[PDB]
Amino acid sequence: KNYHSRSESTVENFLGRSACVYMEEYKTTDNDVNKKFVAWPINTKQMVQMRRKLEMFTYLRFDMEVTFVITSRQMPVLTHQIMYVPPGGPIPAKVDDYAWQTSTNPSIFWTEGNAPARMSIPFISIGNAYSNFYDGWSNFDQRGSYGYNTLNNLGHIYVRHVSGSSPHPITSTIRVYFKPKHTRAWVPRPPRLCQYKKAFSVDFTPTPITDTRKDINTVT
Amino acid sequence: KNYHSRSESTVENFLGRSACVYMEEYKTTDNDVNKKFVAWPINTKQMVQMRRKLEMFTYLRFDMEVTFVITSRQMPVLTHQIMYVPPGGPIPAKVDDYAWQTSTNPSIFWTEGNAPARMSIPFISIGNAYSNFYDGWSNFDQRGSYGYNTLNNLGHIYVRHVSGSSPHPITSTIRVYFKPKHTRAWVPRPPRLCQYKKAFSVDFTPTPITDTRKDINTVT
Amino acid sequence: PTMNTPGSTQFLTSDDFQSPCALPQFDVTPSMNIPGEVKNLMEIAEVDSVVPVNNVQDTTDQMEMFRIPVTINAPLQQQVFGLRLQPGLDSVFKHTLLGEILNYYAHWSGSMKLTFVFCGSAMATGKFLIAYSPPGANPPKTRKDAMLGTHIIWDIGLQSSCVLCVPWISQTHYTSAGYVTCWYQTGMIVPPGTPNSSSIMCFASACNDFSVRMLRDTPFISQ
Amino acid sequence: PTMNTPGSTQFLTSDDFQSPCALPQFDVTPSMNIPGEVKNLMEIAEVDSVVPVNNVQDTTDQMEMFRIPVTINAPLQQQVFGLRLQPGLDSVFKHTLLGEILNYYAHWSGSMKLTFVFCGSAMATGKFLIAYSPPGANPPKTRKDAMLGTHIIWDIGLQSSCVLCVPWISQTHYTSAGYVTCWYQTGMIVPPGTPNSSSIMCFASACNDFSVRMLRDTPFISQ
Amino acid sequence: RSITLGNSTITTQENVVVGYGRWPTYLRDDEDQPTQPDVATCRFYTLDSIKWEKGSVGWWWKFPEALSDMGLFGQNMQYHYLGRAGYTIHVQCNASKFHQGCLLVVCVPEAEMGGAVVGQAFSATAMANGDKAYEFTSATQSDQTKVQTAIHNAGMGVGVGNLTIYPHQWINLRTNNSATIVMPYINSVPMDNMFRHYNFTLMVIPFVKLDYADTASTYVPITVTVAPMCAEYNGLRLAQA
């Protein structure tokens, strides 16, 4: 052991890590149209560890990048339409409709046997920074939703399997990796001390501050 | 024959050679969870030849690189999660747990039919050089382990086959190659003259110094 | 002379490579100068935080954990509190600001600062012996033993804050750890019409500089 | 104008190519200046080492291998020892420092240095004829034959170290090899109250410079 | 003639073999981690006198455990935690001109020694135990709780003839009679706990057995004198605000 100095504690290389955030499966043929494609609203409040890190700041400004790892099991090459609907775009409600054919939705076409698909979504928002915490209401009558604003909203990623007239009976599994880039953070905030109970609320149940020991004078 | 000079005896290009160090197999489906993935603590005391070379020095400082050659036998492309747990990280105890999903463990994703996977681990240690030999105890009561310190410790490489909901009944075989880079060495030490009996001890049985001849005056 | 070399056709999940922009021809809303920009996680740890020194086995409420009790009646040689400096594993400092930042790392060292502030009546007076034991040393068992070591006689009458910068604070992953103890020297003396109890609060910081190396996940909130 | 040329999409297991760093954004502990840095394996071989000249067929213990015996009683023309210089295959030099370094290579040449130090009583005197035979030459069979060649008359009385730099030391992979022999010339003479035995130790080095070419594994420790 | 060295005790003697060409030196020659150089430690701590008999094999002393019970140095090891020191070792034997023998005085840094029975563990009392000259033995050792102690392999499995790499000096009774080896501090961490780690081991190996003729003293007394030089420790006091 010796002292020296640090530079691994800078905000950018603290919160900037690739981490899995969503994993889902889909089957190209079945009786449920819900399961013929994958939907995924982008948010960073699903992975508990990742959430806790980001919630030590109130305002955050970053442009993310999303990498997909797709595998498939049962013959020829198979292609995937990895569409990105940005906020206030049209969303598909079923596999094959005009919402897939929309030309304002950036859509990757990646075929298997090649290095993973990737794209870098920029800083979308009409605000000047995403806000993790919001202490307000959706309307000024104050009877609406609590702790929700639309300026921290991010789009949806919809993945479907590009198929011919009659699909195969294949099934695929996707995994999504998410990594902030060029992070800036403003206003620090105390760490969490309770276990999360909701993915959107700040709800908690009271818990003791710290673990107990036999006596104040007793230390071993 | 003629004289000239040398430059093949420098420390860097003596100890810096790619050499196989571990080979193991795993089956994705069976009744033993131990055999569904590969574990491997990194050390250079398994290949006898490689060991003998490195043990001619007491302190060594190097940053290694690890290349993997993976083959598989029984249809579609198959991907491998080649995770690196560094010292004091969480280790998976079974295939599929949160330790695989940890974002602080550098994990390659390599799919077959492409040039071998590789990464270069840097010089990890809080010391100022790995020490091959240690003449001490783990505690100052001197009743602990002998000839073991934690400052020469290196992480583990865990390899698993990225699979869908239900794996295939494939089986794979891995081979690991290991090569020091930018080696520096301090304090030289006499070569070994006994056959190794343990992979961590310096234990030996006495052996004669050299082979005998008929008479001191007799030379042929 | 090639880029098809082994180990350059993979997803290494820690890439520093640049990637295509999903939607170019889009203007971002330029940054605003919002108060309180953060540049390190170390700035967070250099803010003083109330440590819960008291945390007895049977604790009636959770707000008495920050209060070390001091009373009129108690012998002249008696111990007030004990601490073991190890701000990453000791229960006292485990969940403080300094504790939280430290647990995201696997190697750390430096110095910390402990301020002891008497929050009590404005008429009380007395003396205490805040004593420090080096890393190897055993905690003193009597006030006399404590006094031989390093000690500060903190006069409650003329001061109400005692700041102790402590060196040799390291990770240590039983253990060699310093100790801060405090002992009665005179007891608390009050004039008529004054309460017979007072308390001492305690604070902790990361002092001038600390150094943290190698990221790790917290072992607190479980996935 | 391509990098998809044949022979550039393989693992050649001796690559000098650079590769991605597993974890960047990690600070290494800077190097310390530790005594005795090594830069070549040749530095190791340039350190003198006790060679076991004596290694008779029936050897009672292993510590008498480093002692060449010299006694009061023995004819005036008698041979002390014989050596065949071939420091990579001859049993004498096989496991010395010089031997070990050499066996990791497949080509080597240069000169070696042999020092003969009489370790014995401080009252003994005598003379020896350390004789050298060229590579092609046969070892002498008598002291008279030996004396005609290259010989040094080493006086045990006025010196106690005889240093012989020997040239033409090569790999030779029977064999042409030099020979160093030593012969009695006067015998050992001692005054009353002195032991009737003494010994000669021997050392070996790699002299000013050697050159080693092409790596090879040792044929000693088996896998 | 006689260059009388004084420190706080006097040793009269009359080459210096530096460990690797590095003299002992303070770490300050290069708050958070203050140090406390103790400059009263140096002085000649003369160890016990072993007898070199005709039928003897060799001897070894673990450092710094040999000086664990020696005065101020011993005390500081108990008090302080982290400490670093270099040593000046004077191994002198006294013999006549009718005695013949050879010794290899060698300082071996970090020597790990295997057990007598392969795959067994032994206690710390089998290597060091205050100031004692542990004795190497001829042939094998079959006592389970002992170190291997076979002279020809030096108890490390390296071959005894090759120990000449390490800083060594030969005491040939024919000519010289003194060996001065100035060992510097060699470790991979700036300073370490002096109980856990045995930094180096001094070995005296007789390569030629003593022959004393007749009606002369049957032993040659070998005395070891160790002076710890430039010993630094860790501060025990708090820093400023």
Numbering used by the authors:
A (entry chain A), B (entry chain A): 54 to 127, 137 to 282
C (entry chain C), D (entry chain C): 3 to 175, 184 to 233
E (entry chain B): 14 to 27, 30 to 45, 50 to 260
Show me the paper's own sentences about this structure:
For CVA9 in DPBS, the addition of RNase gave lower fluorescence values, indicating that either nucleic acids were present in the CVA9 preparation or vRNA was released from a small percentage of the virions and was degraded by the RNase (black dotted line). Incubation of CVA9 in 0.01% fatty acid-free bovine serum albumin (faf-BSA) induced a fluorescent signal starting at 20 min and reaching its plateau at 40 min. faf-BSA sequesters fatty acids from the virion. Addition of RNase in a parallel measurement showed only a slightly decreased fluorescence readout (red dotted line versus red solid line). This indicated that 0.01% faf-BSA in DPBS efficiently converted CVA9 into expanded particles and only a small fraction of virions dissociated, releasing their vRNA. Compared to the intact virions, the two cryo-EM reconstructions of CVA9 virions treated in two different ways, 0.01% faf-BSA or ion composition, yielded RNA-containing A-particles expanded by approximately 4% in diameter. In addition, these reconstructions revealed more flexibility in capsid proteins and no density for the lipid factor. The MS results indicated that there were only nonstoichiometric amounts of VP4 present and no VP4 could be modeled into the reconstructions. Further comparison of the two expanded particle reconstructions showed subtle differences between them. First, less of the VP1 N terminus was ordered in the ion-treated CVA9, where the first modeled residue was Ser60, compared to Lys54 in faf-BSA-treated CVA9. In contrast, the faf-BSA treatment of CVA9 generated more stable A-particles, as seen by the fluorescence assay and AF4. The CVA9 treatment with albumin induced expansion in the majority of the particles exposing the VP1 N termini in about 30 min, whereas most of the particles still contained vRNA. When virions were treated with faf-BSA, the lipid factor was bound more strongly by the albumin than by the capsid, causing the capsid to expand.
Coxsackievirus A9 (CVA9) belongs to the Enterovirus genus, species Enterovirus B (EV-B) in the family Picornaviridae. Like other picornaviruses, CVA9 has a small, ~30-nm-diameter, nonenveloped viral capsid. Its positive-sense single-stranded RNA genome is ~7,500 bases long and encodes 4 structural proteins (VP1 to 4) and 7 nonstructural proteins (2A to C and 3A to D). During cell entry, enterovirus capsids undergo conformational changes leading to expansion, formation of large pores, externalization of VP1 N termini, and loss of the lipid factor from VP1.
